[PDB]
């Protein structure tokens, strides 16, 4: 029972770590996609 318990507890730990990881990576690509959208605005003024 403590075998299965500690497997599930390490699983829960790895889960919380992974949620941190995905929101981290997403939060960093936010500013990237923002700047990319701004250059797109510049490029559209260029087209016009």
């Amino acid at each position: 029972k403590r075998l299965n318990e500690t497997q599930r507890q390490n699983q829960l730990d790895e889960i919380k770590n992974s949620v941190g990881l995905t929101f981290k990576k997403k939060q960093e690509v936010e500013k990237s996609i923002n700047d990319s959208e701004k250059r797109l605005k510049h490029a559209m003024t260029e087209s016009t």
Binding site: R2, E5, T6, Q9, L12, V19
Partner: protein
């Protein structure tokens, strides 16, 4: 080498018999408390 050279060609008599060493510290071990069930309590990340 030395001439001090204690000459006594006989069996001796037991003087102080071997006893259990009269120490109160460290024939024992160190106590250790561990349990995966105190990794139990978790937070609910709710804000974001």
């Amino acid at each position: 080498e030395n001439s001090l050279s204690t000459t006594s060609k006989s069996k001796r008599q037991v003087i102080v018999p071997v006893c259990m060493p009269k120490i109160h510290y460290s024939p024992l071990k160190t106590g250790l408390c561990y349990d995966v069930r105190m990794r139990y309590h978790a937070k609910i990340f709710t804000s974001y």
